[PDB]
C-alpha cells in the first residue's frame, strides 16, 4: 500500500461543464426544485462523494517493525523448509533448462527467489539463467522483502547474503534511538 | 426486434411413420410495421380467430376498418404460400388457428397545445401475425348443458372431505 497512488478522480458538480443557471423557477412549474443541471441527481451531473484527485496511501511502519518482519519471514521459510543456503550462485551453464531441472530434482517450489550479496557481482551464469525465467527471480541482498519472499515458494540465499542479513537485521536490535537520520555520519555506522 | 414468427416456417419435422395420423400443415405468416394501432388491429384479429380461411376473407372483405384490407392481403399471401410451399392440397381447407396483433416500432412527434404547451404524439405501428392450420375449423366449444353443470356440482359435493381431523 505505501507505494500506492490511486489516480482516480471524478468531477464534482462544480467541475462538471455548465450547470450555472437554474433549470426552471422554484415555483409554478409543477416540477421538482433544482438549481443546476449538473447536480449529483441529474444525468451527466457531478459525483457527490467520488474519488478525489490522485490520493496517496503512504505510511511508514517503524523500521524496527519492518526489520522484525524480515526476520519473521526468514524464520518462516526456514521452519517450513523453503530456505536453501548456498555457497555461491555460480551455475555450470547459463541455460535456464538446467536451473529448472535442478529445482525440480531438489524438489524446490514452483517459484524460487535467489538472492546475492550485490547486484554488480552477481555471476553471469545465474544472471543469464534467471533473465529468461519467470518463476525464478534473482535479486540483490538489498532487495529482499517480505512480499517477494512470500510470493516465491522457496528462498535461495548465499553465505555472504546470510551474513549481510544477519548484521543488518540484528543492528536494529541494540541500536540507539536515532539522534538524526542514519544517512548522516555516526561514530560506528558504515 | 424479434422475428421468430418468420423462423417458425423453417422447422422440419421428421418423416411420419405409416401408422401415424397425418400431421396438419401449419403456416406462419406476418406483416410488420403496419401504420395502424395494435388495439384496433386486435379486434379484427379476434374476429377472424378460429374461422376458415374463406370465411375470414369474406368477413374482412365487407369490414370498413382499414386493418381489414391489410389482414385480407396477409391471409391471401398465407394461403398462397401454404399451397405453393407447405404442401397444402386445398386452398379452402385452412383455418386461422392464431391471429394476433403486436406493437411495432413507433415514432414520437409533438402535438402543439394552446399555451406554449405540447404533447408527445406516437406514430403508432403494429405487427400482424397469423397461423393457418390445414383441416376444417375446429367446432366451437358447445355451451355446457344443465346435465353437465349439475354433474360438475355433484362431483364437487362428492369431493368433500372431513377437513381438519383424522
Amino acid at each position: 500500500n505505501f507505494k500506492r497512488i490511486s489516480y482516480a478522480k471524478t468531477k464534482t458538480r462544480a467541475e462538471v461543464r455548465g450547470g450555472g443557471r437554474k433549470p426552471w423557477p422554484q415555483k409554478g412549474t409543477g416540477r421538482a426544485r433544482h438549481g443546476s443541471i449538473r447536480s449529483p441527481l441529474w444525468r451527466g451531473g457531478g459525483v457527490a462523494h467520488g474519488p478525489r484527485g490522485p490520493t496517496s496511501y503512504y505510511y511508514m511502519l517503524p523500521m524496527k517493525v519492518r526489520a522484525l518482519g524480515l526476520k519473521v519471514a526468514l524464520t518462516v521459510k526456514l521452519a517450513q523448509d523453503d530456505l536453501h543456503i548456498m555457497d555461491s550462485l555460480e551455475l555450470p551453464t547459463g541455460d535456464p533448462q538446467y536451473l529448472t531441472e535442478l529445482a525440480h530434482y531438489r524438489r524446490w517450489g514452483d517459484s524460487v527467489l535467489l538472492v546475492d550479496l550485490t547486484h554488480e557481482e552477481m555471476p553471469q551464469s545465474i544472471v543469464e539463467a534467471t533473465s529468461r525465467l519467470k518463476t525464478f527471480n534473482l535479486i540483490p541482498a538489498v532487495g529482499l522483502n517480505v512480499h517477494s519472499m512470500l510470493k516465491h515458494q522457496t528462498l535461495v540465499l548465499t553465505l555472504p547474503t546470510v551474513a549481510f542479513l544477519e548484521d543488518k537485521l540484528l543492528w536494529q536490535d541494540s541500536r540507539y534511538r536515532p539522534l538524526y537520520p542514519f544517512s548522516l555520519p555516526y561514530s560506528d555506522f558504515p | 426486434i424479434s422475428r421468430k414468427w418468420e423462423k417458425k416456417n423453417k422447422i422440419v419435422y421428421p418423416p411420419q411413420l405409416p401408422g401415424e395420423p397425418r400431421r396438419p400443415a401449419e403456416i406462419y405468416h406476418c406483416r410488420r410495421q403496419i401504420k395502424y394501432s395494435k388495439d384496433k388491429m386486435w379486434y379484427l384479429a379476434k374476429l377472424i380467430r378460429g374461422m376458415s380461411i374463406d370465411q375470414a376473407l369474406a368477413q374482412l372483405e365487407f369490414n370498413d376498418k382499414k386493418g381489414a384490407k391489410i389482414i385480407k392481403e396477409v391471409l391471401l399471401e398465407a394461403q398462397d404460400m401454404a399451397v405453393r410451399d407447405h404442401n397444402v392440397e386445398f386452398r379452402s381447407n385452412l383455418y386461422i388457428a392464431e391471429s394476433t396483433s403486436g406493437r411495432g416500432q413507433c415514432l414520437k412527434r409533438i402535438r402543439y397545445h394552446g399555451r406554449g404547451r405540447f404533447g408527445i404524439m406516437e406514430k403508432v405501428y403494429c405487427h400482424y401475425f397469423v397461423k393457418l392450420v390445414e383441416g376444417p375449423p375446429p367446432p366451437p366449444e358447445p355451451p355446457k348443458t344443465a346435465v353437465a353443470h349439475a354433474k360438475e356440482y355433484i362431483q364437487q359435493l362428492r369431493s368433500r372431505t372431513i377437513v381438519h381431523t383424522l
Binding site: 426552471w24 415555483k27 409554478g28 | 415514432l107 399555451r115 406554449g116 404547451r117 404524439m121
Partner: peptide, 19 residues
Amino acid sequence: KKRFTPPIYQPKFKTEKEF
C-alpha cells in the same frame, strides 16, 4: 403579484427522431 411561469419547450430532436 401576478404569478406567471413561462412554458418550457422540450428539445426538438426528441420528437424529430426518425427510423
